Amino acid sequence: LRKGNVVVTGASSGLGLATAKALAETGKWNVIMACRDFLKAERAAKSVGMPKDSYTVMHLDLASLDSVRQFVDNFRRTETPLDVLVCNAAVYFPTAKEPTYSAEGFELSVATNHLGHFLLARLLLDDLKKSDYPSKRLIIVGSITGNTNTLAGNVPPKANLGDLRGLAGGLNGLNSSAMIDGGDFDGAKAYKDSKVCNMLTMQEFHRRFHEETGVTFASLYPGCIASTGLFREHIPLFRALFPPFQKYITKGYVSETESGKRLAQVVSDPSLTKSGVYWSWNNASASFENQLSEEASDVEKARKVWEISEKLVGLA
Amino acid sequence: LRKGNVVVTGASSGLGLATAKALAETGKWNVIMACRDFLKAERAAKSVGMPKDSYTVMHLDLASLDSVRQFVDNFRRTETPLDVLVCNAAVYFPTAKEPTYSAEGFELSVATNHLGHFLLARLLLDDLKKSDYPSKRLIIVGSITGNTNTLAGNVPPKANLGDLRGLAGGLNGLNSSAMIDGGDFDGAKAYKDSKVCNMLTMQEFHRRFHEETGVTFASLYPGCIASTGLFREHIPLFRALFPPFQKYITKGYVSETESGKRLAQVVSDPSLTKSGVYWSWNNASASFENQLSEEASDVEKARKVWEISEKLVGLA
Amino acid sequence: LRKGNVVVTGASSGLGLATAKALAETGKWNVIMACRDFLKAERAAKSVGMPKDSYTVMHLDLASLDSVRQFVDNFRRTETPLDVLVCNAAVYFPTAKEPTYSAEGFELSVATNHLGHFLLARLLLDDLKKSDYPSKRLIIVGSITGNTNTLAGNVPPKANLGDLRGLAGGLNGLNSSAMIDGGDFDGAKAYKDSKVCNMLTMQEFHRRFHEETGVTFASLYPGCIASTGLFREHIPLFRALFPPFQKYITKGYVSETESGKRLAQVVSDPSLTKSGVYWSWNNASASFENQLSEEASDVEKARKVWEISEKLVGLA
Amino acid sequence: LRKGNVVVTGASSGLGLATAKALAETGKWNVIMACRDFLKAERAAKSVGMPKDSYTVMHLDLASLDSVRQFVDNFRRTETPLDVLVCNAAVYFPTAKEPTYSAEGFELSVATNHLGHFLLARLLLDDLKKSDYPSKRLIIVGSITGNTNTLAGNVPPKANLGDLRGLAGGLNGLNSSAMIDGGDFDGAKAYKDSKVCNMLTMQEFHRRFHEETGVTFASLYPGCIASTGLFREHIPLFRALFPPFQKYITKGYVSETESGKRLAQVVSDPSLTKSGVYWSWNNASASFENQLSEEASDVEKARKVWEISEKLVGLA
Ligand SMILES: NC(=O)C1=CN([C@@H]2O[C@H](COP(=O)(O)OP(=O)(O)OC[C@H]3O[C@@H](n4cnc5c(N)ncnc54)[C@H](OP(=O)(O)O)[C@@H]3O)[C@@H](O)[C@H]2O)C=CC1
Ligand SMILES: NC(=O)C1=CN([C@@H]2O[C@H](COP(=O)(O)OP(=O)(O)OC[C@H]3O[C@@H](n4cnc5c(N)ncnc54)[C@H](OP(=O)(O)O)[C@@H]3O)[C@@H](O)[C@H]2O)C=CC1
Numbered sequence A, B, C, D: 001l002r003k004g005n006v007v008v009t010g011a012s013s014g015l016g017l018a019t020a021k022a023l024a025e026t027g028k029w030n031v032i033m034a035c036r037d038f039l040k041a042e043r044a045a046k047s048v049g050m051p052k053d054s055y056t057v058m059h060l061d062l063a064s065l066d067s068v069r070q071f072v073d074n075f076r077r078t079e080t081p082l083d084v085l086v087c088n089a090a091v092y093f094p095t096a097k098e099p100t101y102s103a104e105g106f107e108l109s110v111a112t113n114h115l116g117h118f119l120l121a122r123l124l125l126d127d128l129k130k131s132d133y134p135s136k137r138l139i140i141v142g143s144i145t146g147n148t149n150t151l152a153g154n155v156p157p158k159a160n161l162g163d164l165r166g167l168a169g170g171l172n173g174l175n176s177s178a179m180i181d182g183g184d185f186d187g188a189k190a191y192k193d194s195k196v197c198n199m200l201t202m203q204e205f206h207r208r209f210h211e212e213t214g215v216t217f218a219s220l221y222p223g224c225i226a227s228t229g230l231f232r233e234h235i236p237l238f239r240a241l242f243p244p245f246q247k248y249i250t251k252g253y254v255s256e257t258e259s260g261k262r263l264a265q266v267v268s269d270p271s272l273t274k275s276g277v278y279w280s281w282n283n284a285s286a287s288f289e290n291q292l293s294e295e296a297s298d299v300e301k302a303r304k305v306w307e308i309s310e311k312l313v314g315l316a
């Protein structure tokens, strides 16, 4: 079988670097690392010892739609088939009193996590359909805290998308609120809302394109990878205390290598061919279909998100 | 006359942002801002109020040759003529005890300042030749401290390229020294050596291509722009003390706007059509041809630099 | 002679209420009070005892261009000649840590004070030209603190329009700064910058239309009217202490009636027919031509302001 | 090509004797040595071994206009073409408390250095124009200390031409000051002012006659020739100490032969055909265009000098 091509976002840092390492040590994949920092992506690829032939770094800054369209035109210029697209990029700002916004004016957490991935996926889907590979998949990462069923979701600050009032406003923050619900700005709630938007995006993609094409859509929660850089902006005391807290008190700590092997299994396991599944892993390395929260599963809300995002990015 | 296209590097920060502002408020230029951070480049363009039509951000990480070739292929895919190329990018590490290296192994100051610009210029020169614009120019920035004639050049740490011993080694730093001369690593000497390499590059380009094509080659020293981010890695006390020191004691302080208008004058002045000139500006906004140091003007050394760099980047 | 029509902004509060009282007790003027609050404008008109026949309240919210165009269409629907236009509206936010923005996204102080008046004046100028009245004038209010020549201008926070960097950005506050210079947001500096913009607007109007039409353009500083509502948002201690401080220590206190009679004199005095004058009053009720600051008198900067404002409001 | 004729002033002493030696050992020039002492000029010509055929001593005392006109009438009586005119004469009085004046009353330093050369050049220019030689040049010597950009210019006594107050007075010293600025008499300042006047004279000649005729105008600084007789009037201790001081501490010492070969290169080099250049030489015998001081480059001041000198010498 032809070595398959995998476009993986945010490969510079832990999760994507591990996934690329796992999918390149096999020798059966060509990985394309789409990252904002080109130099940070070379040092990681060399450090992790991925073969030179297998990787091919390319630029992609999700916060800027122009960067996305440029990446797309270059990727179509390479005249290479596209098989699997992984959306794993994210920026988290726990302790911001004043928000930072992206190029088109959107709050930075929601543009990087959802809108950019939303545009990239829809643009590259046309390339995915015209691919002769046996299995085509589109992987979207998610977090357990997005769902409120679990204790992690029920922490004092939690996610909410009550009326998509902010998204309709355009998230500019002018004569409006950056938060989708419309409440006071909170660093965590925006990230959680973006994760929920990603889950709804997966559901809607399954509903609209699964029968038409045959492109598997999936989402997964790897675990609490406390060693990565997502908490870089957090205070040091947190960074230090959190990993032991997860290891011993909550027992949800997962090693980086385990998370990479899990995501790669999602990418390349024949068994996991059911679309529209919020995957999850057990303590014994067992893959199961976890259950989403009520709001996350709402059809109308997801439709409302789909149309609003489509208008905002200029797809209309 | 057709609005001319200007590819300007490092536009995100002071000098290139000012140059783009100056060349875009006229309305007679299309500027292409080639910068490592796409988001930092949008916020600057909006803040400086450049017209939307005039600017078109594109990615370019000089430390990675792959990024350069990608930028080149995309720029040729846009099917747009290229008229003027400006090389103004630089990274300065005053207070590093251990050096940081670029993707191909070269010390970070020499790859960004000289090697990347050297490859980009040679690749884009073919595009420059096939351009119907009346005036085609290639601007390379330089610093006065590179020359040792002046007091600024005679500070206790100063530039030296004695045998190009490090460049021949390949600057990997393995079984060798990163410094071109071969001495103990110094943060400033590397940057100054790169500036000297840029001056020699201009001279050699003038000798090899001025008669054949008709592409003007120029270098300029704007002044001590103490407000920019080049000194970001320096200690705070320096950042604070240096600007007044230049303003009052050495009287070499130049405003950012003045430096931008000067560089833009170099870009678009009909009078300044003499190639191979190390330009400079007077207190009264007067442009003169300053004189380089003995070593900077050495023909054999520049030839030796040209061949070594050509081999290192894979042009051979 | 026909009773002349005077459109006076912000008549609800002190300065415009006094001006309307002065121009209506004569019986020689029809005043049109253009104010954001219609009810606040009736209670003031009744309280000040202006004749019912003379006044005719109409709506105008400067922060919203739609309101301005609506007011203009209604005023042209009344089929009444327009003779004198007075721009005296202003909102001041001394103690704001987070800024409030107007409908089109502009910072609230600069849109109300300058942009709205700029659009209204240019739209109504066509009506002014086609008026058979002997004397046609356009009055723009200003403040002494806008000029830095005087001690009032040299208070610790002072005005600055260094590059019109914010105005070119569009003052949205997204990926930019609301302040025109680009500095950290200050409540007072915005208001002072708007006053400077108004002075430059008067100068440019004099240069562009005085010869063509014959419409006198004027600006004036009445004095420190400490009894008005401009300081409503300030703390109480200031409101209490400031009036005596001006009365006795700085001796710049002027009664409201004096300010109204002065502005009305500007409106209706035959002697004061010289255009482009920053008027001012002496202790003995003597009118003199005060001198503006260097920056306020800059031609290029005023041209730059004119073009930018014209583009922003959609006149282009 | 015809052996060209070179009129060289002050050939008796070092610089002109060396220039004549250089231009006569070639065998391609006829040199006319215009010197105040006829006997001192024969002993030098014999000592330096110039061919008898090549030299032809003639009298010229710059301090006396009558001598200049006599020299001119004799030179026109010889019925010989004139190609190149060199003005290198100078008298320096470092340690004079009471000044010595020339025949028409002018202070001796300014008449010999500038006024006499000014009259001779203008009179002989008519002869230069009617010459069929391929290259016609007019060489005026200058000194670096005239410019205040360099450390040599910033010695405690320095040059100044503030209002040309003395030149307008006529330099008689009666009811006036001999110094051009009007200050107390200083031996050095007069000589430096005369050098500045010579530079301005070159500039004005370039502006007024370069396009009309095609006569190249040039000025040059050879270096510190400490072996000549200019310091004859100085104390012995200076004469002794200065040459080593220049050789070792300031490293500006140039041998007499080098200065002569440099000036002769200016006279006869095809490359150096750009007019209005303040030439200079590098340590490696490299000719460059040095930059004059602000005052030296002032157009109005040079015009003012031109008209005043023209009136004083009776050209009017
Ligand atoms: N505890 C955890 O960490 C958990 C992890 N996850 C998931 O892990 C995923 C990966 O984040 P994680 O690896 O953990 O931590 P990281 O933030 O360190 O990895 C994030 C990656 O996103 C990349 N990135 C950020 N912004 C952009 C951009 N504008 N354009 C392109 N790439 C960008 C970053 O590039 P760069 O390297 O330069 O920063 C980095 O490679 C997240 O999507 C999150 O949902 C899920 C549950 C919990
Ligand atoms: N005192 C002075 O500042 C003097 C200035 N100069 C010249 O000024 C020039 C500009 O540096 P300056 O504006 O002063 O200070 P800056 O470093 O802030 O500007 C440097 C620019 O280079 C860009 N850059 C850095 N690395 C890369 C890369 N790998 N790829 C693409 N772009 C990159 C930076 O992008 P980013 O914005 O993300 O950092 C930035 O825009 C220098 O070349 C220097 O020789 C000359 C003499 C003295």
Ligand SMILES: NC(=O)C1=CN([C@@H]2O[C@H](COP(=O)(O)OP(=O)(O)OC[C@H]3O[C@@H](n4cnc5c(N)ncnc54)[C@H](OP(=O)(O)O)[C@@H]3O)[C@@H](O)[C@H]2O)C=CC1
Pocket: C009, C010, C011, C012, C013, C014, C015, C016, C034, C035, C036, C037, C040, C060, C061, C062, C063, C087, C088, C089, C090, C091, C112, C141, C142, C143, C144, C221, C222, C223, C224, C225, C226, C228, C229, C230
């Ligand atoms: N110390 C001082 O007071 C000095 C006064 N001045 C000038 O006095 C002028 C008047 O301000 P002042 O009377 O002193 O204090 P006020 O603010 O109380 O008067 C301001 C007027 O502007 C009106 N206004 C505010 N916003 C709008 C809007 N969006 N649309 C229409 N009208 C609006 C207000 O209506 P409403 O009544 O509902 O608030 C009010 O009538 C100012 O332009 C200022 O430059 C000059 C120097 C100093």
Ligand SMILES: NC(=O)C1=CN([C@@H]2O[C@H](COP(=O)(O)OP(=O)(O)OC[C@H]3O[C@@H](n4cnc5c(N)ncnc54)[C@H](OP(=O)(O)O)[C@@H]3O)[C@@H](O)[C@H]2O)C=CC1
Pocket: D009, D010, D011, D012, D013, D014, D015, D016, D034, D035, D036, D037, D040, D060, D061, D062, D063, D087, D088, D089, D090, D091, D112, D141, D142, D143, D144, D221, D222, D223, D224, D225, D226, D228, D229, D230
């Ligand atoms: N350190 C230096 O010496 C430097 C030299 N120069 C230039 O060198 C040039 C030559 O002076 P330099 O050779 O150095 O020293 P000298 O004074 O010994 O040479 C001067 C020449 O001028 C001649 N001369 C003086 N007065 C008259 C006159 N009234 N009529 C005709 N000729 C006259 C002298 O004749 P006589 O032989 O009888 O004295 C002598 O030949 C000067 O113009 C100076 O600007 C420039 C910079 C520094």
Ligand code: PMR
Pocket: A092, A094, A143, A144, A145, A151, A152, A155, A188, A191, A192, A223, A224, A230, A250, A252
């Ligand atoms: C007991 C189960 C459990 C698990 C598996 C997680 C994972 C989890 N640890 Mg949450 N967390 C759990 C619970 C708790 N830890 C808690 C706290 C906590 C904080 C402060 C934070 C966090 C986070 C999470 C996250 C990581 C999501 C992230 O990286 O953004 C999951 C999966 C992370 C987040 O929510 O930020 C947006 C973060 O800042 N947890 C609390 C309160 C003490 C409880 C009891």
Ligand code: PMR
Pocket: B092, B094, B143, B144, B145, B151, B152, B155, B188, B191, B192, B223, B224, B230, B250, B252
């Ligand atoms: C008197 C003239 C003069 C001028 C125009 C500059 C410009 C200059 N200021 Mg140097 N500098 C001058 C002299 C001096 N300042 C000096 C010091 C100094 C430092 C520490 C530094 C510097 C620098 C420069 C540079 C800027 C080059 C840079 O941005 O990298 C020039 C043009 C800059 C540099 O060399 O770093 C690589 C830097 O770190 N100068 C010293 C010792 C006190 C002297 C007397």
Ligand code: PMR
Pocket: C092, C094, C143, C144, C145, C151, C152, C155, C188, C191, C192, C223, C224, C230, C250, C252
């Ligand atoms: C001595 C003359 C003088 C005059 C005529 C005014 C008028 C003036 N009193 Mg300023 N002011 C003067 C000076 C001073 N009082 C000062 C302070 C001051 C404050 C805090 C304020 C003010 C203001 C002014 C203003 C009114 C402008 C306004 O209403 O916005 C003028 C004309 C007003 C302003 O600047 O806000 C934007 C305001 O908030 N002045 C200071 C510092 C103690 C000095 C010495």
Ligand code: PMR
Pocket: D092, D094, D143, D144, D145, D151, D152, D155, D188, D191, D192, D223, D224, D230, D250, D252
């Ligand atoms: C460091 C450079 C330098 C150069 C190239 C010259 C040439 C120079 N040495 Mg000045 N001089 C320099 C500097 C200095 N020597 C200095 C002094 C000095 C004196 C006293 C004199 C002089 C002179 C010069 C002159 C010769 C001009 C002349 O012959 O008239 C130049 C070119 C000469 C002059 O100025 O008289 C009018 C003379 O009398 N220099 C001083 C103070 C110690 C400094 C540091």
